[PDB]
From a paper:
The [name] complex is a widely conserved regulator of peptidoglycan (PG) hydrolases. Instead, it functions as a transmembrane signal transduction system for activating PG hydrolases. Briefly, the ATPase activity by the cytoplasmic [name] powers the system through its ATP cycle, interacting with the transmembrane [name]. The signal is then transmitted from the cytosolic [name] to the two extracellular loops of [name] via conformational changes, and finally to the coiled-coil (CC) domain proteins.
Single-particle Cryo-EM analysis allowed structural determination of the complete WT [name] with an overall resolution of 3.9 Å. Cryo-EM density provides a perfect description of the full oligomeric arrangement for the [name] system composed by two chains of the cytosolic [name] NBD domains and two chains of the [name] with TMD domains inserted into the membrane and the ECD domains protruding to the periplasmic space. Dimerization of the two [name] protomers occurred through extensive hydrophobic interactions between TM2 and TM3, and the interface between [name] and [name] involved a large interacting area of ~960 Å2, contributing to a stable MtbFtsEX complex with a robust ATPase activity. The ECD domains in both [name] monomers presented a well-defined density. Specifically, while the ECD dimer of other Type VII ABC transporters, such as MacB28, LolC29, and the recently resolved PaeFtsEX8, are oriented with their lower lobes facing each other, the two ECD domains of MtbFtsEX face aside in opposite directions. The kink occurs at the hinge region of TM1 that directly connects to the ECD domain. The kink in TM1 of MtbFtsEX alters the orientation of the coupled ECD domain, resulting in a distinct conformation in which the two ECD hooks with the two lower lobes facing in opposite directions. The binding site for [name] is a large groove in the middle of the ECD domain that is formed when the two lower lobes are positioned on opposite sides away from the central axis of [name].
Residue numbers in the entry:
A (entry chain C): 4 to 145, 152 to 294
B (entry chain D): 1 to 295
C (entry chain A): 1 to 54, 63 to 213
D (entry chain B): 8 to 54, 64 to 213
Amino acid sequence: GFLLNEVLTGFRRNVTMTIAMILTTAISVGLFGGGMLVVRLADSSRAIYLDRVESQVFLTEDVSANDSSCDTTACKALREKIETRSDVKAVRFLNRQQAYDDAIRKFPQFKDVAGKDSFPASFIVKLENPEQHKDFDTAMKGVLNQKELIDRLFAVLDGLSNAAFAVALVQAIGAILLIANMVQVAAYTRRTEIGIMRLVGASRWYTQLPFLVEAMLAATMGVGIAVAGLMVVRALFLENALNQFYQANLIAKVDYADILFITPWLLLLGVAMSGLTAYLTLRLY
Amino acid sequence: MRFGFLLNEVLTGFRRNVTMTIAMILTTAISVGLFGGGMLVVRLADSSRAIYLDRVESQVFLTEDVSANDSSCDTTACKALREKIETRSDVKAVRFLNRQQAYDDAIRKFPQFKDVAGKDSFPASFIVKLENPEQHKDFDTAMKGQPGVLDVLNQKELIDRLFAVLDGLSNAAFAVALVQAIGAILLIANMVQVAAYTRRTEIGIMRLVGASRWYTQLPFLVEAMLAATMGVGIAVAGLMVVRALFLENALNQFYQANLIAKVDYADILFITPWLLLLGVAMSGLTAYLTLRLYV
Amino acid sequence: MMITLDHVTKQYKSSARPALDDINVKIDKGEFVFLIGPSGSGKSTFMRLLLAAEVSKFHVNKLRGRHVPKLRQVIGCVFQDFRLLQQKTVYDNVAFALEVIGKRTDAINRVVPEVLETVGLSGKANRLPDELSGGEQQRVAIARAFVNRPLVLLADEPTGNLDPETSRDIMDLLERINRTGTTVLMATHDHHIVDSMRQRVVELS
Amino acid sequence: VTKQYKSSARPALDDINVKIDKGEFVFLIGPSGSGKSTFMRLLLAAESKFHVNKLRGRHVPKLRQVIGCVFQDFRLLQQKTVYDNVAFALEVIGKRTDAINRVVPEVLETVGLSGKANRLPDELSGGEQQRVAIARAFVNRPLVLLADEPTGNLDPETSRDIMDLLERINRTGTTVLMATHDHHIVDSMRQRVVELS
């Protein structure tokens, strides 16, 4: 630890060829960041929707009025008629109080200008087969439910996520073997540096130490430029992509705090991977 | 003879070094595969014009009976609606369309309804743009209430978001591709360097006894070009398997909901003549120039 | 008489020292020359300028990319580290240089059994092609230069790292090669060379 | 001890057990050259304070820091300078910053070239080229010194100067093992040789 300005000798030997990995491991460590990012935003966006099988009953709202339990004259009949059908499992209802808090907690886009009156009673219910949809909607029509009429966030967000991990893993192995043979040729281009150590009996740790030191520093630079790449590809590219989905109240927004939240995990992954694949090839040398 | 005296020792280059070659395969495969993924979305966005309107109109639907007579119309009510819709204060140019081409292409615009598609179920269009995109709701409020029309269909800022995010990846996949593409270029400069460090006695002996213009760099160029071709092949194979494994489950409903017109795994083979030369030039011309720098 | 450099001065990597000064020497056909040893200087300098610097049909002034390879085939060279690999057999290691020019496939083998006994290698030709001792390395190094019919060959410090009783035989075999029709140029910083041919030379540094 | 380098007849591994380990200047006569290098390479990393290569392990680099060596040719790096080259084998064994530059020109005063420590190694003369390697071979006090062909490729006057420097540097009490290339210089100082096959 007393000597620190000796790993820069390798960089001054080859800037133009040491640079070849920093931008190459950038896609290998930033595609994992993007794949974790889309899963992180998908798990937040799943709250505002419903599950796989669900219905909404918004046809009648004056019979709900302000009473919590739907057992007031005709409200008893309207609550009792839900479970009369055989294609349901359980019944539930929400009061007038559950009309503005759920529209503010689940929707941070706006928390006011509602008055707990625009959202009626839920009377939501789940079914078995998600195929008839409209027939079950018209079963009690006498109901703003979406169900699976549009299948986008259920499918394409997970598909692009699993496609991002596949394109990460198809060249992550190439990155791991590129580290190993790259530090192998970095040792092979300086035969005398290793040989003078073996002649004077230097320790086996300290002989392969500066290769590992420059490997961690250059991999840390690679993870940093990948984090910068994910920060810029949200900003410079796809500007009118997530904001206009957020203002449409369809996809939950993403801020820049979760990039920082996954950043130490990303550095730990890059550092551990680079150390494992450098010690494995310097065990031979 | 002429194709065998050079084929015998180039395989010894892969045999003597098995690790750097697969590095070039797996890195060049991304510089071609991700570029193909970025080119498919561009060739999909322009092919999604057949079922979408362009940047601004407001489609209006009118009653069939006033359009059911003659070719266009026979009464003065159509002409009155024409002169009322011609000025409309702010706009200046309108389009008058009839029911002959309103059925249009029934196998592409409505491939889900290519059978049950009458020529009288589609009324006249009377389409007109707007000078600005921010007054669409005002125009829809102003148009409705006039008798003789059915409904007004807008196509902007309710459906066009998905086209906006579609082209967003076009200038996003190219950025990630071109970041690592120059790394894939420069790796080819040191492929010959690693071959020269691993094999310096043969190149030194050939330079000592005498080598022609194309004598000893030809194995390096073939080892670069065939690696580029194998990288392009594994790139399009990986693109095919990732599309058919992770994208068909998301594009079937989008084709069903009539949001993308074409969507097919045949444009991938339609661009591979356009794609193979870009894969081998960035690994071949770089190797042909870096040997002038080295020897 | 074509092998003659007059008033030619160059420095190793533009050094302040004159290095190779304007040395005027004329070499006729089959004229043996050694190195006078200017205080044991860097013998890589002033020896490698005969080809690829900074000799029969072209001088040292006509330099081009299509001029060096044609006139590089009339000249051979003998190095020190022998440039012989253990990954290829010794019988074909001398035959590697033939296809760099390019001849017929059957034309390769019609000359090997009348050149691999000129330096003497029939006793050790195919067996032990990888585990090859240092004695025959100079034999195969000299035989690599005789696969063609060159005029002049460069042989700098060919004694290696071995005892002189097994080094004098290289000069003994090279002595009878000179009157075959080729010129041998020698470059070593060793004594007892003037007692081999007994001819007066010049002393230039 | 006994070893086999290959699967053929080895003229160097004759199971010859000769050792002095306290002589002033003894050296090995080499008939083959390559086979003489195995005896020098036997002392470290083949198969003193301890009895040869017996009971090796992770304490091998502790004992390889005592003897040291010099090659026939080069052992050089051109990125550094001659001062960095001669002091390069001082911080890799572990020393204080004042301990490394505690005495600089003792090692350059024993080689005959003193001062001008800022030259690049490429600017050195050919006859004094391996002089920096001989200087690096004795930067600290050794117990032995296996000079495998220290004469190398050099002029006869420069080789005589290098041999005189080697025969003077061991006046402290070390042992310098030359490897023989000729038989008119190396048998001209009346020092012991070896008999082998």
